[PDB]
Design an enzyme around this catalytic site. Structure first.
Site, PDB file in Angstrom:
ATOM      1  N   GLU A   1     124.695 -23.517 162.901  1.00 21.63           N
ATOM      2  CA  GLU A   1     126.421 -23.423 162.787  1.00 21.63           C
ATOM      3  C   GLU A   1     126.724 -24.653 163.666  1.00 21.63           C
ATOM      4  O   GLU A   1     127.977 -24.252 163.778  1.00 21.63           O
ATOM      5  CB  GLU A   1     126.465 -22.250 162.918  1.00 21.63           C
ATOM      6  CG  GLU A   1     126.315 -21.177 162.037  1.00 21.63           C
ATOM      7  CD  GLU A   1     126.753 -19.754 162.013  1.00 21.63           C
ATOM      8  OE1 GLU A   1     127.757 -19.400 163.075  1.00 21.63           O
ATOM      9  OE2 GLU A   1     126.235 -18.771 161.359  1.00 21.63           O
TER      10      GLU A   1
ATOM     11  N   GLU B   1     130.651 -18.426 170.624  1.00 20.65           N
ATOM     12  CA  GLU B   1     129.958 -17.402 169.706  1.00 20.65           C
ATOM     13  C   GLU B   1     129.597 -18.246 168.277  1.00 20.65           C
ATOM     14  O   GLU B   1     129.453 -17.597 167.322  1.00 20.65           O
ATOM     15  CB  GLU B   1     131.145 -16.415 169.052  1.00 20.65           C
ATOM     16  CG  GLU B   1     130.451 -15.201 168.728  1.00 20.65           C
ATOM     17  CD  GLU B   1     131.737 -14.001 168.592  1.00 20.65           C
ATOM     18  OE1 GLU B   1     132.965 -14.449 168.517  1.00 20.65           O
ATOM     19  OE2 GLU B   1     131.411 -12.859 168.024  1.00 20.65           O
TER      20      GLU B   1
END
Ligand code: A1BLI
Ligand code: A1BLI
Ligand code: MTA
Ligand code: MTA
Ligand code: CL
Ligand code: CL
Ligand code: NA
Ligand code: NA
Ligand code: NA
Ligand code: NA
Ligand code: NA
Ligand code: NA
Ligand code: NA
Ligand code: NA
Ligand code: NA
Lengths: 301, 622, 622, 303
Positions: free
Chosen positions: C432, C423
């Site tokens: 990220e 995720e």
């Protein structure tokens, strides 16, 4: 409750366990009795048990049917074992301390007890009347341990994070007296009176050193580095010439001679060793409890 | 009324517990975020690998409840300044864990104790945590008004409590806080949760906490005296302390268990509520000044800048100031022209800086109160304000008032003046450049002419406010000197501060000046307390005429006059002042043809740098 | 509903006039602060010395009324760019006077026209006024959508209106605004009051005003078509323009006199009210995104930083994202282990970054929806989040989920995984650091193992927003590069902007990587409009499993998914892009052992500087 | 060898005077830029309007000579910390005039005394002058190793020199310098011209001046002991101090008139030259380390 705090053998050979939840949704405590000691900790094979409103920090037998508790709530409470010993009911629960009650010890009579709270105060109790007689703010930090004199009501030991070990004598107008080694060493944590010498005790410090003290000589005769971390408990054996059991946050039990030499050691515990109690029926058998929820039974050579 | 919280060290069901304290009447809860007795090992096996969970879930409350209701508490076993290397390392790792979990829940504040003298490592670990991303969280440092060692019962036979007074010794609790906050570099996230024992110390110990950032005041249930009925109350000296704390607008925390067992816990809050509802209800000055407390402001320059319409509006409604200006003119008219000369003698009266004309109006009221004829000139340099006057001149006044749209230093007058009436004073008397303006307007004053005001004098007083020192330090701006903020004065209603000496006069000016405007003044301030000098509060007095005066000098302050707040001259580095020592401050008024500015230095007990040399940081435009 | 004002050039009694427009239903009034025809001389006698007052008094309204209700208007005679030296000098002095009087009254905004091509001196005088003390006042530049010259009646015999299309010529009104705001150095106090004529221009002329700071839209009464009943209405194409302006949340001004005489003036407002109440009422995405419009945010780094509790809370409530993650697992379980093997075969399933375990829950739902046995591992590096999991593991899940308190790059696993479920995607797919994390976790994936997601791709699109360019420029901080703010990406719900080309793919990553993570990508963006490039909007798509995907790519955007807003890569200096030209942008993904960062440059139609060289301004921590 | 200058308070012909001190063997000259006794009024008539010239012409030397050879000296009458308001104001205007004329000639350095405890206004006026354009000029603050009050002859009957030791009292001369340089905000343009009296104080008073920016060491002709031959020399303890100052690489100034009249003025320089040529000549470490003294460097990171 996962974390076991107290473990005390009664005269007849029954095992009293104080416990608390120090993690999870609920942060309460409980008191059990085990007439079969090799059944513990398993709740399913117990004689009696009860839930307290908050966790227990220290515990003591009041004779045979009485259980005096030092609560997180700041209460000292006395629970009464049933006529059948199949039910534990509250007699008094007195909110007199302003912080966690961390230590309790019943005086030689068994009609009075003294408590030590993180609020820095030491208080003397009348268990018959369920009120406080004396309130002593002697220390300058958390009261760690309070040990009643084996044979004298007016006398008892106390130690605190102010680095003071106080010898008490409530007969005096100034009851407290500072006593220890030559230099101010590491903080005192555990206190055990010698069962046969009324005037000597052992104190365990936070650096893992256990020291043998003479009140009369006011000088430390011998110390030893037993544990690698803080000494949380010191309990003497019922033997004619007694053994000294030392507990620690290094998760290790040690049993020592009169001169604090290592005779036994156990790495059985995987978390902190909280309390130790010698079998009154088999003096070679020593029972420990820890925060790993283990109730280990030791044979001592 | 009082914003108050409950301190507990025991929380079985966070749900039930928090529901009970809110029902008790508290606004928030101070609790442990890990069980206080749950000591944790980070280095040595096998305790290192203790199965979790390590504390109770963040799911047990809403983010709103964590954000508003919950104050964290450092587990009492955590001792980063222990003498044992192992206990230090565990406490280091443990402290970061508890602080980082506090930040995870988004707690408004987190409590840490100052128990001992050496909290160096505690300060280092907290400083480390604060510089781990810019995250707005408060750290309430729990400090006792008296150390537990110095209030212990005199019951240790071979170590008695000293029956002698140690002036500095009884303030050791403040040096704990001072050394801590100094190590952490005066972080605005680090405030005092002052803990108040059963027996207060000497006032000098309590006074020691003025100017310090007190966010919370902790009241143990033990310090509450019982009364006839059974209710908890506090001693007259405890009430005094509570009243002083309510002015600082602190949050009151109740710690310890209930000793008044025949009462609900609100009994304690009910008393605080009763207390705060029975404080004296000032004031004329205070209620008008409510909101401006320790709020820094740039000093207005009505000469260099044109004042805004709303600025004028709020300063023509000070009836005391204009009562005094009216009476000042009232008496001058009588003294100048006799009774038998009242209809023959008309006095040429000039308002120099008339703005929207509240002094023009004052001059008219004074004239037909004294019953004397006057010819008015309303000289005003602000052309926006001149619009207001000319509208008012056409509509109301008439040809009695000649509205002059000029600078008074430039204006070539038709006739010389009997009275020049002006309003050019600032918080520090001469900081709005009244001297330079009236000097340039002096030539058109009659040889026997009066100036209103005739005289004004500036006053200075050394102050201690770590709070106000923080506020100045926070005024660093890009594209200028990093320390420029310290080398300029601020207008501020000084609130959380400590006046360290009686105000003394700095600079005086007389008008007309029958004799330059540059000045040099040395002051010696006797200090009778241990303290920390952060700057100098500035006030002023002025002689409008004879016995009619205005003052913001706190001693002689004009009743309910909101026209001026005090000025603050900061200093770069706080100076330690020990009891008995003298604060020696030096003030210069400097000028060229274009700028006027103040320079200042402390020369005792330590030398400061000369502040604002050559007006490099701050000038006032001519 | 619609915040709207009245524009008048005639105000006899400011009291009566303002009372009437408020009664008409307007929220504010645009009026002259000096009589429009009252021309004033500043140089040459005798008009120089004209007796006052020069305008009406500030006493005629409350400071609140001036502050809220009154928008100023520059007197139409004031022409600072006149060809006559004398008219320039008068206009200069006159403009400062009107602007300074505006500032005196504390007006929320003041209107100035852009009538002609050369407003250089007008810009200089306004720039002078803006840098006369930091004073918060808005300047609405009145610009027509079509210049009066280019909508004049074709009724001049010897000078006809050209019957040919001049693409750039019809946009001249925008170059008026662009040249003005560029001269004034992109002041946040200078906005557009766009004036809309009877006949709209081509869409490209209207599109030209996207990304521009439109605060007001001016609607003359003349542009309103009459209907059967008598009410004023607007053409379908005018309604479109109004609907687009209502999204920008502009204030609508009504200028000109009433032409629908048999109706109250609210008839015009009633229609605007009716219009804004009959706009389409989206949305799933829009209503959740309401508040975040053109609001710059630092991109979160869930790896380098531990995410807060409330951060997690708001991103486990995206049912679309977890519907897709559930279905992705649902289908993978079926494809991997056959029906006859359902009870024998248990699939070792690992959630790498489980936080508070919404993916652990998704994995459980998918398992007993597909009816297959699974063994769960919940690997989580955030120790604060691990507390939530272990509480949930003990209470609910059981031994099915093994909660691992480790980094996935470090964790030495007991057994290899059938499916690794993650995720770790950001607004720009890989920002990220999903690639680096899963690469380090790849070794404990079974040789025939699936990764969910299997694939993700970042998209870039050139944008025009002078509004968003201002917001970035305003992010200059002390103690760093003055231009650092331009050399870092921002997460932002891009709102007032113009997409100048169709999004194209930048960087792709596959898992498992059966083959480094550094990249270099050149893109060529065909631009079919005259515009100004301010930066590049970044989006992403990801293949969770087979046909189940997530996207914030506007074309293919997952319906009502609020988990990700788009990212913005700014550029230091805006680049002029003429119709037909190609925007050539260059994007690098750079890394060492410690940091991952993006570098980028424009190489056509002009070269920009390489932004964030060596990550000097922006790095993402490993 | 030793870079040294001559301090004079009397200069009839700047041409002849400077030609003589260079012939004597000095590298530069410390002189007044206005006649020391020429007191000047700036406020009150009629002295306010005194016809010029106010000092001697800048034409009398080359810009090179002003740049290299001439150190300015604040006129001794200039007292900005006088108790008299009038004398303060005159001294303020006078000090700016002398400093601004120093800057006009482009002098390498200008001498200002620290005579008393309170030099607050002196510091303020110098600070004002320093922040009047970024102009590279040195200000040598003349400070005595021992204050004139604390080395006066014990010959005042009703006020005797205390026969007790005041550890801090004997260091008061350092607090003069510390308070001054602190008020001026540690300006790199403000250095110490340490003046050394006939009788040295305790080592702790001398040690007090370690780490301080000493640019010059002033040696009055009076402190030089005469030897058998007639030459000037210094005591073993004075030599020690000179040896420590030669390591700091200070410029040695000779003030006062010739007391060894049967010798040329180089006799004083000859001794300094002889001294600096007879210092111990280390070292292995020192000669390799020569150039890096108090030179800040970033610590290398070979990793
Ligand atoms: C209407 N008219 N028209 C003509 C003349 C006037 C009156 C007038 C023209 C200027 C001035 C005055 C009065 C009073 C004093 N001003 C300055 C105002 C801010 N200054 C403060 O000290 C200060 C700050 C913030 N708040 C303050 N008080 C609060 C309490 C609620 C209001 C005071 C510094 C002072 O010099 C100049
Ligand atoms: C609960 N749990 N527990 C375990 C895992 C999760 C879910 C989780 C863990 C981290 C993340 C997610 C979801 C979604 C995406 N995040 C980041 C959030 C800010 N980012 C945005 O783009 C952004 C900014 C501001 N507002 C946004 N949306 C508004 C509309 C109302 C909410 C999105 C960048 C993105 O990568 C990381
Ligand atoms: C009431 S504050 C003083 C007023 O006097 C005005 N003022 C200040 N300086 C001068 C000056 N030199 N000449 C005329 N008016 C002045 C200011 O604009 C302000 O309205
Ligand atoms: C839901 S956002 C991704 C989650 O995975 C966690 N995470 C990010 N990187 C890693 C990693 N390398 N190992 C384990 N967990 C991670 C983050 O703490 C966050 O809770
Ligand atoms: Cl007051
Ligand atoms: Cl969308
Ligand atoms: Na709070
Ligand atoms: Na400081
Ligand atoms: Na200046
Ligand atoms: Na300035
Ligand atoms: Na408005
Ligand atoms: Na630009
Ligand atoms: Na780097
Ligand atoms: Na960086
Ligand atoms: Na020189």
């Amino acid at each position: 409750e996962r974390q076991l705090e107290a473990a005390r053998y009664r005269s007849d050979g029954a095992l009293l366990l104080g416990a608390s939840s120090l993690s999870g949704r609920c942060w309460a405590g409980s008191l059990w009795l085990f007439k079969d000691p090799c059944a513990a900790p398993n709740e399913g094979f117990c004689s009696a048990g009860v839930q307290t409103e908050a966790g227990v920090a220290d515990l003591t037998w009041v004779g045979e049917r009485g259980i005096l508790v030092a609560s997180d709530s700041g209460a000292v409470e006395l629970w009464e074992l049933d006529e059948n010993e199949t039910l534990i009911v509250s007699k008094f629960c007195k909110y007199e301390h302003d912080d966690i009650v961390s230590t309790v010890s019943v005086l030689s009579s068994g009609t009075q007890a003294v408590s030590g709270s993180k609020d820095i105060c030491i208080k003397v109790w009348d268990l018959a009347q369920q009120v406080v007689l004396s309130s002593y703010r002697a220390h300058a930090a958390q009261v760690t341990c309070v040990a009643a004199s084996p044979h004298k009501d007016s006398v008892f030991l106390s130690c605190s994070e102010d680095n003071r070990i106080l010898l008490w004598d409530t007969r005096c107008p100034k009851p407290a007296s500072q006593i220890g080694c030559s230099a101010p060493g590491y903080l005192p944590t555990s206190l055990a009176w010698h069962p046969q010498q009324s005037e000597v005790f052992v104190f365990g410090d936070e650096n893992g050193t256990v020291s043998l003290v003479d009140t009369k000589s006011t000088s430390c005769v011998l110390s030893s580095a037993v544990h690698s971390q803080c000494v949380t408990g010191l309990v003497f054996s019922p033997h004619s010439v007694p053994f000294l059991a030392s507990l620690s946050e290094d998760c290790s039990l040690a049993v020592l001679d009169s001169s604090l030499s290592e005779l036994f050691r156990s790495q059985a515990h995987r978390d902190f060793v909280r309390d130790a109690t010698w079998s009154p029926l088999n003096h070679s058998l020593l029972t420990t409890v820890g925060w790993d929820h283990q109730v280990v039974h030791h044979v001592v050579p | 009324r009082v914003s108050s919280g409950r301190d507990l060290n025991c929380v079985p069901e966070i749900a039930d517990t928090l529901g009970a304290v809110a029902k008790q009447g508290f606004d928030f809860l101070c609790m442990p975020v890990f069980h206080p007795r749950f000591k944790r090992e980070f280095i040595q096996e096998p305790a290192k690998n203790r199965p979790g969970p390590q504390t109770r879930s963040d799911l047990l409350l809403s983010g709103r409840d964590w954000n508003t209701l919950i104050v964290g508490k450092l587990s009492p076993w955590i001792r980063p300044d222990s003498k044992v290397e192992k206990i230090r390392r565990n406490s280091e790792a443990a402290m970061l864990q508890e602080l980082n979990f506090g930040a995870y829940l988004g707690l408004p504040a987190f409590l840490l104790p100052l128990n001992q003298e050496d909290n160096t490592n505690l300060a280092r670990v907290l400083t480390n945590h604060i510089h781990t991303g810019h995250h707005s969280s408060m750290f309430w440092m729990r400090v006792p008004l008296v150390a537990p060692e110095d209030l212990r019962d005199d019951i240790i036979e071979n170590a008695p409590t000293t029956h002698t007074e140690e002036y500095s010794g009884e303030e050791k609790t403040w040096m704990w806080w001072h050394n801590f906050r100094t190590l952490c570099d005066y972080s605005k996230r680090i405030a005092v949760a002052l803990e108040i024992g059963a027996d207060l110390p000497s006032n000098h110990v309590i006074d020691r906490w003025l100017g310090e950032p007190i966010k919370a005041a902790i009241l143990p249930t033990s310090i509450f005296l019982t009364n006839k009925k059974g209710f908890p109350v506090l001693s007259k000296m405890h009430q005094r302390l509570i009243f002083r704390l309510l002015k600082l607008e602190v949050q009151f925390i109740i710690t310890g268990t209930n000793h008044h067992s025949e009462k609900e816990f609100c009994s304690y809050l009910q008393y605080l509520e009763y207390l705060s509802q029975n404080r004296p209800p000032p004031n004329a000055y205070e209620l008008f000044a409510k909101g401006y407390e320790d709020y820094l402001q740039s000093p207005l320059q009505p000469l260099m800048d044109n004042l805004e319409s709303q600025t004028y509006e709020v300063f023509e409604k000070d009836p005391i100031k204009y009562s005094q200006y009216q009476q000042a003119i009232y008496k001058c008219l009588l003294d100048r022209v006799p009774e038998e000369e009242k209809d023959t003698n008309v006095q040429v009266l000039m308002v120099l800086g008339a703005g929207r004309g509240p002094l023009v109006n004052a001059s008219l009221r004074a004239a037909k109160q004294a019953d004397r004829r006057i010819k008015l000139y309303a000289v005003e340099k602000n052309p926006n304000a001149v619009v207001t006057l000319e509208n008012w001149q056409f509509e109301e006044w008439g040809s009695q008032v000649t509205v002059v749209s000029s600078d008074m230093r430039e204006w070539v007058a038709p006739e010389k003046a009997d009275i020049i009436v002006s309003e050019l004073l600032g918080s520090f008397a001469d900081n709005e450049l009244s001297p330079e303006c009236l000097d340039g307007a002096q030539h058109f004053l009659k040889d026997d002419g009066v100036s209103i005001p005739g005289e004004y004098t500036s006053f200075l007083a050394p102050i201690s406010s770590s709070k106000l020192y923080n506020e100045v330090r926070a005024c660093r701006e890009k594209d200028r000197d990093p320390e420029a903020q310290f080398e300029m004065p601020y207008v501020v209603r000084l609130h959380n501060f400590h006046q360290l000496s009686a105000p003394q006069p700095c600079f005086t000016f007389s008008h007309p000046n029958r004799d330059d405007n540059n000045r040099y003044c040395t002051l010696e301030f006797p200090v009778e307390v241990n303290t920390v000098l952060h700057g100098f509060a500035g006030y002023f007095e002025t002689v409008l005429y004879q016995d009619i005066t205005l003052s913001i000098r706190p001693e002689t302050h004009s009743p309910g006059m909101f026209s001026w707040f005090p000025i603050l001259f900061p200093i770069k580095q706080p100076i330690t002042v020990r009891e008995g020592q003298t604060i020696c401050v030096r003030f210069w008024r400097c000028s060229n043809s274009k700028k006027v500015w103040y320079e200042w230095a402390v020369t005792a007990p330590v030398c400061s740098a000369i502040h604002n040399p050559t007006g490099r940081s701050y000038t006032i435009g001519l």
